[PDB]
Amino acid sequence: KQDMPPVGGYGPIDYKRNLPRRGLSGYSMFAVGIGALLFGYWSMMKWNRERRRLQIEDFEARIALMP
Amino acid sequence: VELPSLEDLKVQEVKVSSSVLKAAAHHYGAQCDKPNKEFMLCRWEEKDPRRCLE
């Protein structure tokens, strides 16, 4: 008279299938990308242009000597 | 060819290093302007740096 099945206490667990979490898609991407990339080239032309100014100063000390 | 003597050499030579020569170097050339720019005409406009020693 000592046998298994309980009178109660059950679930069940699902048979389902779901993890579609979105996700920042669909014109949200391709907009943060271009907005990041244009910040890069804007951070250029303030350094590459400025290094071009110090470049001429480096040639300047050459030319003021050599006679 | 004929060369000048061992004299008209051995002048008071500026014995400094490279960085201390490049230290001022900027104030230097832009305010003397009489002996050096004319020396370029003494070298470019006529060649043979054996004539041009003054």
Swiss-Prot record, chain A:
<comment type="subunit">
    <text>Complex I is composed of 45 different subunits. Interacts with CARD15, but not with CARD4. Interacts with STAT3, but not with STAT1, STAT2 and STAT5A. Interacts with OLFM4.</text>
</comment>
<comment type="function">
    <text>Accessory subunit of the mitochondrial membrane respiratory chain NADH dehydrogenase (Complex I), that is believed not to be involved in catalysis. Complex I functions in the transfer of electrons from NADH to the respiratory chain. The immediate electron acceptor for the enzyme is believed to be ubiquinone. Involved in the interferon/all-trans-retinoic acid (IFN/RA) induced cell death. This apoptotic activity is inhibited by interaction with viral IRF1. Prevents the transactivation of STAT3 target genes.</text>
</comment>
<protein>
    <recommendedName>
        <fullName>NADH dehydrogenase [ubiquinone] 1 alpha subcomplex subunit 13</fullName>
    </recommendedName>
</protein>
<comment type="similarity">
    <text>Belongs to the complex I NDUFA13 subunit family.</text>
</comment>
<feature type="transmembrane region" description="Helical">
    <location>
        <begin position="24"/>
        <end position="45"/>
    </location>
</feature>
From Swiss-Prot, chain B:
<feature type="domain" description="CHCH 1">
    <location>
        <begin position="29"/>
        <end position="54"/>
    </location>
</feature>
<feature type="disulfide bond">
    <location>
        <begin position="42"/>
        <end position="52"/>
    </location>
</feature>
<comment type="subunit">
    <text>Complex I is composed of 45 different subunits.</text>
</comment>
<feature type="short sequence motif" description="Cx9C motif 1">
    <location>
        <begin position="32"/>
        <end position="42"/>
    </location>
</feature>
<protein>
    <recommendedName>
        <fullName>NADH dehydrogenase [ubiquinone] 1 alpha subcomplex subunit 8</fullName>
    </recommendedName>
</protein>
<comment type="function">
    <text>Accessory subunit of the mitochondrial membrane respiratory chain NADH dehydrogenase (Complex I), that is believed not to be involved in catalysis. Complex I functions in the transfer of electrons from NADH to the respiratory chain. The immediate electron acceptor for the enzyme is believed to be ubiquinone.</text>
</comment>
<comment type="similarity">
    <text>Belongs to the complex I NDUFA8 subunit family.</text>
</comment>
